[PDB]
Amino acid sequence: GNKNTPLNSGKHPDLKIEVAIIGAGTSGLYTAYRLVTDKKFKAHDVQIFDMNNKLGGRLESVIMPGMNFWGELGGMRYLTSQQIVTTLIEGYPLSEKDPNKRTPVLKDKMTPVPFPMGDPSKLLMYLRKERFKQNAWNEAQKKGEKLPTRYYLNENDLGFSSDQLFNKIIYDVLMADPWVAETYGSKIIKGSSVYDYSFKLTSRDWDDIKPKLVYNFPNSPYDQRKVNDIGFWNLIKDQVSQEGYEFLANAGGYYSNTINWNSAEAFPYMVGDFSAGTIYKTIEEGYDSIAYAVANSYMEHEGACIWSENKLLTFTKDHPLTNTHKYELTFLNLKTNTQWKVYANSIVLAMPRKSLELLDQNNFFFNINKNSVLNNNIRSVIMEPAFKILMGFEYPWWKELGIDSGHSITDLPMRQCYYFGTDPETNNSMLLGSYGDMETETFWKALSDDKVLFEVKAAKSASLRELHQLDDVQATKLMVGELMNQLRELHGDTVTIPEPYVTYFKDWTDEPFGAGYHAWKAGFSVENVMPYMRKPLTDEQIHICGEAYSDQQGWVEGAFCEAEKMLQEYFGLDRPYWLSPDYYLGWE
Amino acid sequence: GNKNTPLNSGKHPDLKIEVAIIGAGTSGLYTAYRLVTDKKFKAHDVQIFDMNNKLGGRLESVIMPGMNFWGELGGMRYLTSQQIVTTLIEGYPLSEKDPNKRTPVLKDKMTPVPFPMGDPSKLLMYLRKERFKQNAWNEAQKKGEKLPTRYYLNENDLGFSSDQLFNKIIYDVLMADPWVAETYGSKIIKGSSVYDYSFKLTSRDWDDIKPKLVYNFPNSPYDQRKVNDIGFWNLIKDQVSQEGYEFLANAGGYYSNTINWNSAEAFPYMVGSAGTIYKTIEEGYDSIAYAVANSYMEHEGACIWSENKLLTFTKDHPLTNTHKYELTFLNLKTNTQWKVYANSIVLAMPRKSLELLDQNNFFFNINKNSVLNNNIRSVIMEPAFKILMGFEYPWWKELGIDSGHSITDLPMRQCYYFGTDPETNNSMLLGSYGDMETETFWKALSDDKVLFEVKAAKSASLRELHQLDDVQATKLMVGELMNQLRELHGDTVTIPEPYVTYFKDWTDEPFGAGYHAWKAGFSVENVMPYMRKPLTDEQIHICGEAYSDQQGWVEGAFCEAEKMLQEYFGLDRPYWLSPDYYLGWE
Ligand SMILES: Cc1cc2nc3c(=O)[nH]c(=O)nc-3n(C[C@H](O)[C@H](O)[C@H](O)COP(=O)(O)OP(=O)(O)OC[C@H]3O[C@@H](n4cnc5c(N)ncnc54)[C@H](O)[C@@H]3O)c2cc1C
Ligand SMILES: Cc1cc2nc3c(=O)[nH]c(=O)nc-3n(C[C@H](O)[C@H](O)[C@H](O)COP(=O)(O)OP(=O)(O)OC[C@H]3O[C@@H](n4cnc5c(N)ncnc54)[C@H](O)[C@@H]3O)c2cc1C
């Protein structure tokens, strides 16, 4: 099938090429695909290297025995307003509604499906031991009530849901800047209902606002500072009190980023880049199918090669072949523990902050004594931890509360569970747990570090034969134990929860990732850092791309967009023919 | 005065000695002091090296203009049951009550004083917007009430204070182990009041219990596991619910460690006696570091090399006939490297300091010394930040607050009302945060470039105050701390702006932490003796607070150094130290 893309765990000592791409994630794969498809180099002269035994980086889809559908260890969904990932998956143009009348860009067949949001009638919000339905705030407001909670909000914020309060905070901040309220008042909209705030601000509008927006609150410790220079927890507490911050931080799930990051960058991240008709979708064959579709398109050019289980150690300008090649790269061939040299004229580091820090810091590129600016910009983002646990049950116990799909949210350390689906033949049913924020990394770490692993157990269409293949990826007994205990407290006593037969634990804080996703720090010029990272030194053909230093952090689109900007800026490529000239990219 | 201990910022290329001590913190200073006082080596053959421009490491006392008394940036107090730091400060024996009838161990004069605890009638607990007095739980229980709070406790725990609930948790866990309830039931005591739990477990009893204690709770995810293998947040939630954990985590400040660290190690850390009190040193707590440094330095040839940073060390060098090890130092004043030759290396330095050394040498090499690397990572680096703030008057006295500290779930977490100059009335507050993600709340503010501007006050000229320009907190941090201090105390007291601040971030290199905490699942009884000499064929030792069993204390640093000294440097117990003070296995 399409996910058997060949991977070379071998080596070719003294390989000579033009472009070394390090990282077979979304950005690396897309760089390789674009360079060869546009004939900028022959396939043999553009090679990808990865230390992993798979392509896709933070996309990793899995089929667990007994359950014939894809679980997601990493990314799961896209937005149709994200035009690179959307066009590459669905084909062009995006104006055609008939998928049959669309021209595919990539050969691999990918079945787009809507991403289940579920029923807010049946999905749980479990905060300070109070079990609400997610529609509790809506239901209350229809009866003209202000829903009481065990958070002590400011009086003027009482009855607001988390969504409504964020919308209010962002409205209040934008409209206190005279220049913003005047220049964009049209697209910053107070409705008639006290809880009704909407935004029509485009990605390009946000690019105008973010660097200029001033925090205009006369008694605030943060008065007259760029909102850029204010952490998001700082700003949310200043606006709705620390009890307000506890409500918003605890009542948001994976998508909702309430760490103390760049408030200016946080605003668009929370209200969107305007919308109508855009929905969340995934790929029936698993979301990592998009990585395999780009890899396979690159690999259909003979000479193309993904080197797997090959780890970049270091690179230097001081080597025997400076007549043909500016750079010598050293790789560790993990299978053999043998080092080998590669010669290249361009290096693309398609890899996140932690991956950059794990490279030899003593070389000409990273040297702190020389490149203090590089090192400051590498540290311009927060490494956010993310963990995923997939759990297979003999039946979907959640259906007893009328839950089909979607996710429950709680201030318990588990934070979130997605009811991910039921094999209609075996009835075997998948849950995924997603935690990491509000110190929950430290709650779970002790349990995930324990040595005694969960034992697989036979179930419908899942033999011990098949399940012992996943022995080494099982969650720990203590983690499964405590997650079962928290799932019982979350759902309540009315529903029996059986033990799972199979688990799959993934820790994205593991090297070389060191993070699920990244978040701009307060006080950095993001408009200046991004173009800098795409080529840090004026006299070196070394580029950084991927999600970490994108302005769409937490998304494949971020990784594709930084690669695309890098390609137009330094590799002489035009916008792809399949990409609308009106999709907004950046300054260039 | 006693704090002008000479420091050599220079270098001596190819210096040849026996024992290189890296770190002029409490453990390094005490190693040097013990080796020369017991004449194990001549003072020229035992040298201390530090990258800082002062000795004392995580002890740093300061006098700020306008206020004639010592502020503490780092450690502030000791317990009289901590027998090394207590004897070194006060002299021997510890049974004598008259300080005049005591024999000093060190020449420097140090004035012991009680550490002000304050009045729980007047000190604040501000949790989820409810302002209690710290005695609210006691007062309620006297009127036979169960004090209500905005934490939703299990019903069987309602009305308990944070102290009472911890005591209950620890009682319940110990008594569920048949072997413990039977072997130590005598010293694990339920009173008649529902809230009354006390302990008489000694350090030696805890060393017996910690490695064996089993968690006996049949429906628990953690049932039949060593308590050693359970994180403390894990254990507290299993015992009093996640809302119970929120209560205990938020209502502790004062040396209350509720991170997800080793539960077995956490138990003694929480219940601790009688007659033992908290004390400080009137001349500032770093005086104990200066007293040990000065005692070492009164031996001819003794030297603290300051602003000299260890980079690396190797067995592959030109002088292996006289010296097993060549050390390379960065002379920070010149940015030049120089070699030192030695037969023993003592790394008197915490986890982050070890990690900042050249990891590629024979010692740290991960490909060979995987157990060293695992054990270096056996402890959590707990962040700590301190902000001293000088006010023209003690605004806190208006609420009848003399002294002690208020606690809150606001990000500021804790303020100590540290004292008032009786002549100028200038009054010092210290803010202490870092836990419960408060590191990330404050970091954005502390990293901002625009610094708080000093302002003249009684007996504090701009002349004197501009000397501290570069250590002022940021305007944003002072701004937000003032905002949180007003919400903490309430509207009944006006709080003026400070005239001076002093910001200290202990997460800065090379410290990387205020203090350390054993992780769950490590054999601490086996890691400690390992860290004091990791490789059987190398004379390289680690000592200090980080891998002690009294983390967060000078006593931990002294005790690991003392064990290291008796184990590998052929020293006897000091004559001034009681043979009955329990040290470890050896
Ligand atoms: C839990 C989770 C949920 C997510 N949800 C979504 C979502 O719903 N939708 C979405 O669009 N995005 C989502 N994302 C992001 C998505 O996973 C993207 O792939 C991600 O944004 C990163 O792609 P990238 O090119 O930056 O590289 P990465 O995926 O970070 O790839 C980096 C690669 O570099 C390799 N590498 C690093 N160092 C070296 C070295 N020295 N030598 C060799 N190889 C090296 C690594 O092995 C890896 O393969 C999610 C991420 C996570 C973790
Ligand atoms: C906020 C705070 C409050 C505290 N409160 C108390 C308290 O009230 N009472 C109490 O008893 N204890 C307290 N402690 C602990 C106390 O400060 C002790 O000093 C501490 O426990 C550690 O002493 P140490 O020997 O481990 O070394 P450290 O104090 O960590 O000294 C290490 C030294 O090594 C040096 N160094 C590191 N790397 C290198 C290198 N490569 N080359 C050269 N030099 C290097 C550093 O410059 C430093 O001087 C507190 C700690 C903090 C942070």
Numbering used by the authors:
A (entry chain A): 0 to 587
B (entry chain B): 0 to 271, 274 to 587
Can you list sentences taken from the study reporting this PDB entry?
In this study, the crystal structure for the ligand-free form of AncLLysO (AncLLysO(LF)) was determined at a 2.4-Å resolution. The initial phase was determined using the iodide single anomalous dispersion (SAD) method. The active site structure of AncLLysO(LF) indicated that residues that would form interactions with the main-chain L-Lys are present including R76, G553, and W554. In the ligand-free form, a cavity at the active site to recognize substrates is occupied by the side-chain Y254, which is the residue forming the plug loop; this occupation would bring about structural changes of the substrate recognition residues, such as E383 and Y516 and made it difficult to predict the recognition mechanism solely from the structure of the AncLLysO ligand-free form. Structural comparison between AncLLysO(LF)- (green) and the L-Lys-binding form of AncLLysO(K387A; magenta) are shown in Figure 5D, suggesting that dynamic structural changes could be confirmed at the following residues: 251 to 254, 383, and 516. From a structural comparison between the ligand-free form and the L-Lys- or L-Arg-binding form of AncLLysO, substrate binding appeared to induce a conformational change of a loop that is formed by residues 251 to 254 (251-GGYY-254); cis–trans transformation at G251 is remarkable in this change.
Progenitor sequence of the assigned 28 sequences was generated by ancestral sequence reconstruction, and the generated sequence exhibited L-lysine oxidase activity; thus, we named the enzyme AncLLysO. Taken together, we assigned a novel FAD-dependent enzyme, called LLysO and bearing a main L-Lys α-oxidase and promiscuous monooxygenase activity, from the database.
